[PDB]
Design a protein around this ligand. Structure first.
Ligand SMILES: O[C@H]1COC[C@@H]1Nc1ncnc2[nH]ccc12
Length: 167
């Protein structure tokens, strides 16, 4: 039993809700919140910009030190950093950005990072400003993630479409 509330159950391990991931994280304080990161951990917009803003830019400060030490992530890769005031940990995961020409096949590799954590609050990878089809992202999530994932979908219209089209 966990404290996630109001989710629709899609499969044995995947759950979904129309919610603002920032507000969800502040309420639940999950062990892991997933950020829709880029390889430079520049949290300018989308989910990343919103999560970083909610940390009063502390996420960005920590991320800049991480990059200065380690260099950029790989597309499809991840790193674990602090969750600040939102969660114990933030798993920064880089899905492919279609508006940069990146290979959508890397979306499966991106979701594989979730399997290193027993329970996660997450957005749909490569959705929103990353330019992928969110219906496809949900399909890859369900077919790749084996741990317990709670998906927050900000847009109500999109949430309803994802549920109604789910096979
Ligand atoms: O699938 C994501 C990528 O593009 C649009 C979607 N964005 C979001 N999803 C959940 N909570 C959110 N809070 C702020 C932005 C946001």
């Amino acid at each position: 039993v966990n404290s996630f509330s109001g989710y629709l159950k899609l499969t044995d391990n995947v759950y979904i809700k129309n919610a603002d991931i920032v507000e969800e994280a502040k309420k639940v304080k999950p062990t892991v919140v997933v950020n829709a990161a880029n390889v430079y951990l520049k949290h300018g917009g989308g989910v990343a910009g919103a999560l970083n803003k909610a940390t009063n830019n502390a996420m960005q400060v920590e991320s800049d030190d991480y990059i200065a030490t380690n260099g950029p992530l790989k597309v499809g890769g991840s790193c674990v950093l602090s969750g600040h005031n939102l969660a114990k940990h933030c798993l920064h995961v880089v899905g492919p950005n279609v508006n940069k020409g990146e290979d959508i096949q890397l979306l499966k590799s991106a979701y594989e990072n979730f399997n290193q954590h027993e329970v996660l609050l997450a957005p749909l990878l490569s959705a929103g400003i990353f330019g992928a089809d969110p219906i496809h992202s949900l399909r890859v999530c369900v077919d790749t993630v084996r741990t317990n994932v709670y998906l927050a979908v900000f847009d109500k219209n999109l949430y309803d479409k994802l549920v109604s089209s789910f096979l």
